[PDB]
């Protein structure tokens, strides 16, 4: 399964859990990040957006994080408790 396909599946999932406004917040975050914003900022903002109650949806973003930021992202996931 390609990243393109994975992202289509992921967005279909997100639209069942996030509101219309949250989905566009997500889009804008993924956009700032793909354009040079730091992984630290991306992660903290995602956490705030999804909130505690939807944090497990963050696992699904794995395929979209570039290898350079993979360690930071995995550590983030561990820290907020989605890898417990």
UniProtKB/Swiss-Prot annotation:
Residues 1-84 are annotated as: Harmonin homology domain. It is found in: Cytoplasm. It comes from the Eukaryota. The C-terminal region constitutes an independently folded domain that has structural similarity with the USH1C (harmonin) N-terminus, despite very low sequence similarity. Component of the CCM signaling pathway which is a crucial regulator of heart and vessel formation and integrity. May act through the stabilization of endothelial cell junctions. May function as a scaffold protein for MAP2K3-MAP3K3 signaling. Seems to play a major role in the modulation of MAP3K3-dependent p38 activation induced by hyperosmotic shock. Part of a complex with MAP2K3, MAP3K3 and RAC1. Binds RAC1 directly and independently of its nucleotide-bound state. Interacts with HEG1 and KRIT1; KRIT1 greatly facilitates the interaction with HEG1. Interacts with PDCD10. This is Cerebral cavernous malformations 2 protein. The gene is CCM2.
């Amino acid at each position: 399964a390609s990243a393109t396909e994975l992202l289509q599946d992921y967005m279909l999932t997100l639209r069942t859990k996030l509101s219309s406004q949250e989905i566009q917040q997500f889009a804008a975050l993924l956009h700032e990040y793909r354009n040079g914003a730091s992984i630290h900022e991306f992660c903290i903002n995602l956490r705030q957006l999804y909130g505690d109650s939807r944090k497990f949806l963050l696992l699904g973003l794995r395929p979209f994080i570039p290898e350079k930021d993979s360690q930071h992202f995995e550590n983030f996931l561990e820290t907020i408790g989605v890898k417990d």
